[PDB]
Structure formats: C-alpha cells, structure tokens
Amino acid sequence: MLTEGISIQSYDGHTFGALVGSPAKAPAPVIVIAHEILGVNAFMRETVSWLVDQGYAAVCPDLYARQAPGTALDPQDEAQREQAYKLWQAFDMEAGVGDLEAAIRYARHLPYSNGKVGLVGYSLGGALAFLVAAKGCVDRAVGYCGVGLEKQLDKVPEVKHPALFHMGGQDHFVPAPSRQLITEGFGANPLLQVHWYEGAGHSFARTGSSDYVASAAALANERTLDFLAPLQS
C-alpha cells in the first residue's frame, strides 16, 4: 500500500511512491523506513503506525519501483515469497541507497519536520541501513536483521553518525564466523552498536513470522525507540 499522490524523485530522474504517516503533533523528526524483501506490505503499515504513535512522522518508500512499482507481498503465501526472492536477487543495492537518499531529502523538507531524520530498515532494508549510515545522509540509522554485513566491513570507518543494528543469534544468514567478523569489525567504531539476540532467528521482530520472538522483538524495539528519541524536540 502507498499513499496516493506521493512521488519522490531520485538522483537519475526515477520516481517512486511511498506510504507516509504524518505525525500526531508538529513538528516531529521523520523516520524513513527501508522495507524487507516483500515491499511495502502489512508489516510496513504496522511500522509506520507504530512510529507515529511514538512521536515521529514516517516515510516508507517503494524501493522495488525500478523493477515493479507497488510490490506488496504477503509472506504467508508461497507464490508471493517466491516473487520476493526473485525481486531481491535482482535488486540494485547502489540504486537502493540512492533512492533512500532521495527519500531522506524528501523527509527533511516535509512541512512538519523538526529538521532531524532517522532511518530504520528491516531485512533488505537492514543491509541498506548500514550502507546509508556509511554515506552519512542521516542523523541516526537502525538496521534489523541485515544480510551480508560481513562483506561491508571496509565501510565501518566511514560511519560518522550513530547507527544501531539488531541481529538474531540463530540467523542462518549470519553463521558463527560471520557473526565474529561483524562483531570485531563494527566494534572498532563506537558510533556503531550491534546487539545479538540469542535464540532468535532471522525475522524475529516481524509480527506474524514463525521466527517472531516476543521478548527479543520487545527488547530490540525498546532499544530502537531509546536510540531514536534524541531526534525529538
């Protein structure tokens, strides 16, 4: 689902839509949400609503619009999961970073913006959140369950603003050697935080997932909210 009429234009003229939630009160910091491999779906609607209830405005851009505009896939359905994996495999990560940078510019100029912008990404978005943190476009960045962080360690010293990452301890995407690489590499820059959630799998914070772990999701989300709170006026 996207908000009718919202159109953000990117570095190369490509345009894309977004689901936008205005804040309960103006002004407010704006959080750009980078979605999972499933597009702007029920979990994104939930996340927008949650952040608005916590005192933010929220913008969730349609990152799959370079491939198929308005992708919104239900993880309960096999056929739609298969569609998600096909889109992810083909996804241009650098163009994704560019689109998020454009969404962040858009967010900063919203009429109720207090001047501060955060980014929260999940799954695909969690990996993009690290790449955007290394670019420096954003005041604070959070990534849940990003894949392939162990291949991006050269970017650790590029991060100049705070970024927080939540990672499952039983995430098959992040086996023990990868966890060790990320822990040691990210540990070198005190602007970064990486928390591991023992006994939690890849999609431990996604309500409805068979991976969901209420206690871990609760602790990760409390940490996210405490980390974003300094952006509030």
Nearest C-alpha neighbor of 63 from the set 134, 122, 133, 118: 122
74 given a catalytic annotation: no
| Specified resolution (Å) | 1.7
Please give the method by which this entry was determined. X-ray
> Residue 33: left (phi > 0), alpha (psi -120 to 50), or beta?
beta
Q: What whole-number distance in Å separates Cα of residue 128 and Cα of residue 120?
A: 10
User: Does domain 1-233 fall into CATH 3.40.50.1820?
Assistant: yes
Residue 23: asked if its preceding bond is cis (omega within 30°), the reply is: no
Q: What whole-number distance in Å separates Cα of residue 104 and Cα of residue 106?
A: 5
Question: Which of 171, 195, 211, 226 does the annotation list as catalytic?
Answer: 171
| 3-state percent breakdown (helix, strand, coil) of the chain, nearest 5 | 40, 20, 40
Strand 8-9 to 15-16 pairing: antiparallel
Q: What whole-number distance in Å separates Cα of residue 196 and Cα of residue 200?
A: 9
The phi and psi torsions of 226 (rounded to 5 degrees) equal -65, -30
Q: What whole-number distance in Å separates Cα of residue 2 and Cα of residue 35?
A: 13
Please give the distance of CA 80 from its chain centroid, rounded to a whole number: 21
Cα torsion 30, 101, 5, 125: sign: negative
**Number of alpha carbons in the 13 Å side-chain half-sphere of residue 41:** 21
Task: Kindly report the three-state secondary structure assignment for every residue of 108-175.
Answer: HCCCCEEEEEEEEEECHHHHHHHHHHHHCCCCEEEEECCCCHHHCHHHHHHCCCCEEEEEECCCCCCC
Return contacts of 71-80, CB within 8 angstroms, 24+ apart. Answer: 71/38, 71/39, 71/40, 72/1, 72/38, 72/39, 72/40, 72/41, 73/38, 73/39, 73/41, 74/38, 74/41, 74/42, 75/38, 75/41, 75/206, 75/208, 75/209, 76/208, 80/38
What is the three-class DSSP state of 78?
helix
Query: Domain locations in the chain?
Result: 1-233
The phi and psi torsions of 83 (rounded to 5 degrees) equal -60, -45
Question: Which of 62, 99, 139, 202 does the annotation list as catalytic?
Answer: 202
Taking CA 77 as the corner, what is the angle to CA 71 and CA 80, rounded to the nearest 5 degrees?
30
What is the three-class DSSP state of 3?
coil
166 given a catalytic annotation: no
